[PDB]
């Protein structure tokens, strides 16, 4: 996805 | 949701119920899922709420029905407010729920993507507000999950439907001018999807509005496009 959050 | 249709199963895998415990389980607000332990939903929404503790997030639901003392749900480690945050009227109505447990993702459950920073001049043609709160402004929570597909209004136009109120650049509005369909109580926290290039973005957080589907009375929601960086911020922390 465009905008990446750490998992 | 007023004037809206119940969603069919797996429409929206971003939405959540996020329910409250005491004095007695009920669904307190709506969320999206932006992370793997990652909840975005509006900062009013835990007004009074004095620990994470009696917090549950429910995924992958459609019916609230689904929701027994059985049914497996996300507990909150931590409530992050806003710490400009006062009221909703004001603006800063955002918050992120650290979940205590990763949600495993499929067809049921997944995160929805934040709009970019070169999404900020996009223009956004298929809306959608979602939800299970009431059908009118004196109701009750809905069991199906609601959705109603919503245009997006300019800031100046906005400004001009609520006078002695101040329309940030950090606030999108989005309604009919002869209203009838709209977010209404208990919708609030939930997402205003916006389908841009087969992808949906989170666009805006349900916040604050005069009534409910009311004409010359758009929906007030907080632009998630100006709180990417914050979003980053307490999602990313070294
Ligand atoms: C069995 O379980 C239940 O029956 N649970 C239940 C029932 C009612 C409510 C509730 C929980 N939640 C709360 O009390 C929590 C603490 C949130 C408080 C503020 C919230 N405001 C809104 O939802 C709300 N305020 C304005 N708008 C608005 C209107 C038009 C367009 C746009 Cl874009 C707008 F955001 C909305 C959607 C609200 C929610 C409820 C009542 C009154 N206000």
């Known amino acids: 996805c465009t905008t990446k959050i750490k998992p | 949701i007023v004037g809206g249709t119940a969603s069919v199963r797996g429409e929206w895998p971003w939405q959540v119920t996020l329910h409250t415990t005491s004095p007695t389980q009920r669904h307190l607000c709506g969320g999206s899922i932006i992370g793997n332990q990652w909840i975005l939903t509006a900062a009013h929404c835990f007004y009074g709420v004095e620990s994470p503790k009696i917090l549950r997030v429910y995924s992958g639901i459609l019916n609230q029905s689904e929701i027994k003392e059985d049914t497996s749900f996300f507990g909150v480690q931590e409530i992050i407010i806003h710490d400009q945050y006062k009221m909703a009227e004001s603006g800063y109505d955002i918050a992120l729920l650290k979940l205590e447990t990763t ?100 666009v805006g957080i349900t916040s604050w509005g005069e009534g409910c589907a009311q004409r010359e009375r758009p929906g007030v929601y907080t632009n998630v496009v100006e709180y990417v960086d914050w979003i980053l911020e307490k999602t990313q922390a070294v």
């Open chain 2, 103 to 202: 949600v495993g993702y499929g067809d049921s459950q997944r995160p929805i993507c934040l709009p970019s920073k070169g999404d900020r001049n996009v223009i956004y043609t298929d809306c959608w507000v979602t939800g299970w709160g009431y059908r009118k402004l004196r109701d009750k929570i809905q069991n199906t999950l609601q959705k109603a597909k919503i245009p997006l209004v300019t800031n100046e136009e906005c400004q001009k439907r609520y006078r002695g109120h101040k329309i940030t650049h950090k606030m999108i509005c989005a309604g009919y001018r002869e209203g009838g369909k709209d977010a209404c109580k208990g919708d609030s926290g939930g997402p205003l999807s916006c389908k841009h290039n087969e992808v949906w973005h989170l």
